[PDB]
């Protein structure tokens, strides 16, 4: 049948900010993972609950492709059982995740001479995200006892901040494009199968 549109996810011209991470539902298609196997220059390509050697042999009810930009030092947070600013406040994988996480250095696309400030992350939140929770609110964060009433000041902060992607950045501060493939297996008919 027709191939899952991994092309539209991995090769998108524009990627989301991690706080406003993008989800594409994939279903009713053949997932030929050879487009990912034939790439040598991903910085990371790991699967959880399933061997990457089995992807072309398995069937799922749906696949979800989540995509966003973070910085180099944070790529390790896109894994089960991780904590930090991204896993806590921006994008949380469950501990029982079944799927794959791919990232690559995008410094040639996502940095610019005077700095690219287009990509944001959430710096502050009252509590940690649940797995696959998305928070796009811009409510002023109350860091103290005195309420803010939507006015910034002492202990009253805007919750989002720009990554500063300058081409002179160290690898830890360079931009990485991330795709997370979640493999959903419900008590329902499979609509995504590998070519076997």
């Amino acid at each position: 049948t027709n191939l899952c549109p991994f092309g539209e996810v991995f090769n998108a011209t524009r990627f989301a900010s991690v706080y406003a991470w993008n989800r594409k539902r994939i279903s009713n298609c053949v997932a030929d993972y050879s487009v990912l196997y034939n790439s040598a220059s991903f910085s990371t390509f790991k699967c959880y609950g399933v061997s990457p050697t089995k992807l072309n042999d398995l069937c799922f009810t749906n696949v979800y492709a989540d995509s966003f930009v973070i910085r180099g030092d944070e790529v390790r947070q896109i894994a089960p059982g991780q904590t930090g600013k991204i896993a806590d406040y921006n994008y949380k994988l469950p501990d029982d995740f079944t799927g794959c996480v791919i990232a690559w250095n995008s410094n040639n696309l996502d940095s610019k001479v005077g700095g690219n400030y287009n990509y944001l992350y959430r710096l502050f939140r009252k509590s940690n995200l649940k797995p696959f929770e998305r928070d796009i609110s811009t409510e002023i964060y109350q860091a103290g006892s005195t309420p803010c009433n939507g006015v910034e000041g002492f202990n009253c902060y805007f919750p989002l901040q720009s990554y500063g992607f300058q081409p002179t950045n160290g690898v830890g501060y360079q931009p990485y494009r991330v795709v997370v493939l979640s493999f959903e297996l419900l008590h329902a008919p499979a609509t995504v199968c590998g070519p076997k």
């Epitope: 700095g115 287009n118 910034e152 901040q161 720009s162």
Partner: nanobody, 125 residues
Framework: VQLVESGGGLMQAGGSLRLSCAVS????????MGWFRQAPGKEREFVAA????????YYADSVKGRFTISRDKAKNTVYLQMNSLKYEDTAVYYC????????????????????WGQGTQVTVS
């Protein structure tokens, strides 16, 4: 982005003046606009910053309680309401666009701006 200031001119000490700055081009809603000033023989001085979304303001100690920065999202305009003007306030007033979203509004007092206008002359007597 392109910035064009107007409203400048000659004012009595104690008086009231409103500067305008018309913004055209790709601004970020989470980011900020600022006013800075330069008197002759002196270095650039930060005056005020405002976050485009939310409208929270941050002021230099020298203008706090006297000047107010505001913006109209409809008209893509930032205002500086200059009340209780002093001799000291004489300078070229410049509008600035910051592309960077900073969590701490006070950051805009020192964070390099990306775009600035030609400016408008303000003289106090």
């Amino acid at each position: 982005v392109q910035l064009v200031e107007s409203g400048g001119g000659l004012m009595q000490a104690g008086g009231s003046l409103r500067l305008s700055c018309a913004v055209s081009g790709r601004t970020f809603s989470t980011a900020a606009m600022g006013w800075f000033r330069q008197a002759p023989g002196k270095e650039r001085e930060f005056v005020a910053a405002i976050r485009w979304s939310g409208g929270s303001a941050y002021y230099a100690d020298s203008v706090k309680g006297r000047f107010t920065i505001s913006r109209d999202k409809a008209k893509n305009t930032v205002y500086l309401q200059m009340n209780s003007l002093k001799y000291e306030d004489t300078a070229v007033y410049y509008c600035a666009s910051y592309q960077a979203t900073r969590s701490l509004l006070s950051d805009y007092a020192t964070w390099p701006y990306d775009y600035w206008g030609q400016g408008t002359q303000v003289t106090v007597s």
